[PDB]
């Protein structure tokens, strides 16, 4: 089993690039981060900022999560992100994704000591 913090890093962190490198970025990343193993994860966002900057969001703007939880936080600044979503021709195990680059605020749920992100809620 993964820790919640480690699962967040695997699913959502990509500090190795400033932005998605091509239209094939999501197909490659969803596969290599093991999000196409048991099924095609339908939707997933990657954040192209340092781990430190993303972890810092847990000390920023406290807001509600979409489900009503009170431990969500919105980044004060916008961040480079890539949205990955399954597209029409996608059929497990042949997963297919649309890559959309953007620059916006991220909202994450935080837990633990240290208090770190454990869920990606949305971007604004």
Curated annotation (Swiss-Prot):
Disulfide bonds join 26-84, 40-95, 58-110, 65-72. Its main location: secreted. The keyword Membrane does not apply. Pancreas. The active site is at residues 12, 119. Changing residue 119 to A: Loss of activity. Interacts with and forms tight 1:1 complexes with RNH1. Dimerization of two such complexes may occur. Interaction with RNH1 inhibits this protein. Monomer. This is Ribonuclease pancreatic. Glycans are attached at residues 1, 7, 34, 37, 41. It comes from Bos taurus (Bovine). It catalyses: an [RNA] containing cytidine + H2O = an [RNA]-3'-cytidine-3'-phosphate + a 5'-hydroxy-ribonucleotide-3'-[RNA]; an [RNA] containing uridine + H2O = an [RNA]-3'-uridine-3'-phosphate + a 5'-hydroxy-ribonucleotide-3'-[RNA]. Substrate binds at residues 7, 10, 41-45, 66, 85. One of its GO terms (cellular component) is extracellular region. GO terms for biological process: defense response to Gram-positive bacterium.
